[PDB]
Ligand binder design. Structure first.
Ligand SMILES: COCc1cc2cc(c1)C(=O)N[C@H]([C@H](O)[C@H]1CO[C@@H](COC)CN1)Cc1cccc(c1)OCCCCN2
Length: 377
């Protein structure tokens, strides 16, 4: 019954994927960012230079004020607002209506993005990281509690405008090929997983696998980049530099500051390596790997000059809060957030990344010893 939800996501490259939602009675329509890296449902509720519309509580007869304030800090952006509840629907989703907590955003700093076409954010992670505390029930928990929608969703994010699907309540098997491979959700707060091995062009990075998950690894549709802990980032960039040393790149390209360009249609894909992330599996001593192409971590950006060249930003960057498996990792895969069984599944997406000689993949089974040692404590 999921066909109604296929292709219910839109966005601009690097500016997030959003789904259409209605809040209030009568329904007010808003585009809402889909974010598995946070747990608050919040909407613009006051004018802002980057908002074309916003939630007007006064016009909703079903609005209820919770008389508590709230703030959520993200990596760089932040907002504060007033908590309340209201009726919410998803037009291209399940045919249900829920009373959900809504943070009405009244003030913000570097949160809304100019031209992103979304006006709010839907945090799909667990209550443990909700603000102000874990008693503010997240949207998806409300949806499951108040309806019969099964306790899972899946995200199919497609690359180069962007689109995709959020299948709410199940798995749509026409959106992927091959088998689904599942990794345990290590803890219900972020969607935390355990990376047990990293390979670049087939060569093991040969680090203590604890380094990969220091201090955690998460699956985050609300972040563009693959973000890596400092030691892992340095090892990965060194190795990526070595593979592509045929060409010289500005020192600021590797830091995400300067873009690189080539004559349109001459991007030298073959000099950049594939990256394989091995994830903890479902059975003892078993893992699986997902393989990432340079077409995923070299993100296309608009040509800032007058050239008709292809230009790219390096979409692997350094982190101090653990690994983030962001949108560039998720693009091309069908990712199943199986909350009911505490696991996350990966499969090759119908919109998977295409090279002539290489292909993004999800492969298993593999044997990996002492996977338990890879978690950080
Ligand atoms: C590389 O660093 C900078 C950076 C880049 C991007 C997103 C974030 C940060 C970000 O903050 N994402 C947020 C995501 O909840 C994270 C935040 O830090 C962690 C959670 O803490 C609560 C991990 N989950 C969600 C978010 C917020 C504001 C704007 C966004 C997304 O716009 C989406 C388009 C841009 C995506 N790219």
């Amino acid at each position: 019954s999921f066909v109604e939800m296929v292709d219910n996501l839109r966005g601009k490259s690097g500016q997030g994927y959003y789904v259409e939602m209605t809040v209030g009675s009568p329904p007010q329509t808003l585009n809402i960012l889909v974010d598995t890296g946070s747990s608050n449902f919040a909407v613009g509720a006051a004018p802002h230079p980057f908002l074309h519309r916003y939630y007007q509580r006064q016009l909703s007869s079903t609005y209820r004020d919770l008389r508590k304030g709230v703030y959520v800090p993200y990596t760089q952006g932040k907002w504060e607002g007033e908590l309340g509840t209201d009726l919410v629907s998803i037009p291209h989703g399940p045919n249900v209506t829920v009373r959900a907590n809504i943070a009405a955003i009244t003030e913000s700093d570097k949160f809304f993005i100019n031209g992103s076409n979304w006006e709010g954010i839907l945090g799909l992670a667990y209550a443990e990281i909700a603000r102000p505390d874990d008693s503010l029930e997240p949207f998806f928990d409300s949806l499951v509690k108040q309806t019969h929608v099964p306790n899972l969703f899946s995200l199919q994010l497609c690359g180069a405008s962007v689109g995709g699907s959020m299948i709410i309540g199940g798995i749509d098997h026409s959106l992927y090929t091959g088998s689904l491979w599942y990794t345990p959700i290590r803890r219900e707060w972020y969607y935390e997983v355990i990376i047990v091995r990293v390979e670049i062009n087939g060569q093991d990075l040969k680090m203590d696998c604890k380094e990969y998950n220091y201090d955690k690894s998460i699956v985050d549709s609300g972040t563009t980049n693959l973000r890596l802990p400092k030691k892992v980032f340095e090892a990965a960039v060194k190795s990526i530099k070595a593979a592509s040393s045929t060409e010289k790149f500005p020192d600021g390209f590797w830091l995400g500051e300067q873009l690189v360009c080539w004559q349109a249609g001459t991007t030298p894909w073959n000099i950049f390596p594939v990256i394989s992330l091995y994830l903890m599996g479902e059975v003892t001593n078993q893992s699986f790997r997902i393989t990432i192409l340079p077409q995923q971590y070299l993100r296309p950006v608009e040509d800032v000059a007058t050239s008709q060249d292809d230009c790219y930003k390096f979409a692997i960057s350094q982190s101090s809060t653990g690994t983030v498996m962001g949108a560039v990792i998720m693009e091309g895969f069908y990712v199943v957030f199986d909350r009911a069984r505490k696991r996350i599944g990966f499969a090759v997406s119908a919109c998977h990344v295409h090279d002539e000689f290489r292909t993004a993949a999800v492969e298993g089974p593999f044997v990996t010893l002492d996977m338990e040692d890879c978690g950080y404590n």
